[PDB]
């Protein structure tokens, strides 16, 4: 297992929901390899799970601004990768 | 010998700071998740 | 005004409204140098002129994959800058 050391970027959170969003966007990195189709199998588990609904993006290079719902926002790093997901709708 | 004990002195030192981090953490929680409530709450009418 | 031909690659809104983002855009795009700035302005004149609540990602490779409104989503390129501006809340 590649050890990519998770650094969170900004939360308004639980912790387990962040530690849920970490460990499931190392899965997606280690099954798949386009950042869009990351982002999407990500956004679908936790559509599932916590109910929507979300959105997620992957990428290296991307700056973003938008409003959530409160304690459920999360951006983060794994790796080289960027991955943000906010619950807004 | 006392590079290597300088080493595991500071690194055992570093580890105790974790906990009072922890403690500002709930701190924040507390700040955060009490004062949507509390935000949410009031308003001018409610002559309470 | 340097003429970034805007070449849209989604859209599910109309064309005058494809318009104003892309002329928005470019005053976003010449005004801000962080595409953090940029994407903030999209997303906040939006809001001020389409109601909240808009997601805007301004950057030059990133993966999105996001549940939008009907009627509400662009993603279309200023140069090599990648836009994707879509309602949702």
């Given at each position: 297992?590649?050890?990519?050391?998770?650094?969170?970027?900004?939360?308004?959170?639980?912790?387990?929901?962040?530690?849920?969003?970490?460990?499931?966007?190392?899965?997606?990195?280690?099954?798949?390899?386009?950042?869009?189709?990351?982002?999407?199998?990500?956004?679908?588990?936790?559509?599932?799970?916590?109910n929507?609904?979300?959105?997620?993006?992957?990428?290296?290079?991307?700056?973003?601004?938008?409003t959530?719902?409160?304690?459920?926002?999360i951006?983060?790093?794994?790796?080289?990768?960027?991955?943000?997901?906010?619950?807004?709708? | 010998?006392?590079?290597?004990?300088?080493?595991?002195?500071?690194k055992?030192?570093?580890?105790?700071?974790?906990?009072?981090?922890?403690?500002?953490?709930?701190?924040?929680?507390?700040?955060?998740?009490?004062?949507?409530?509390?935000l949410?709450?009031?308003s001018?009418?409610?002559?309470?």
């Amino acid at each position: 297992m590649c050890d990519r050391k998770a650094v969170i970027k900004n939360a308004d959170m639980s912790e387990e929901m962040q530690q849920d969003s970490v460990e499931c966007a190392t899965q997606a990195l280690e099954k798949y390899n386009i950042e869009k189709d990351i982002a999407a199998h990500i956004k679908k588990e936790f559509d599932k799970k916590y109910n929507p609904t979300w959105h997620c993006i992957v990428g290296r290079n991307f700056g973003s601004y938008v409003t959530h719902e409160t304690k459920h926002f999360i951006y983060f790093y794994l790796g080289q990768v960027a991955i943000l997901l906010f619950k807004s709708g | 010998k006392v590079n290597l004990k300088y080493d595991s002195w500071h690194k055992e030192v570093l580890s105790k700071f974790g906990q009072m981090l922890g403690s500002n953490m709930t701190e924040f929680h507390s700040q955060i998740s009490k004062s949507r409530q509390e935000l949410e709450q009031h308003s001018v009418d409610t002559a309470s």
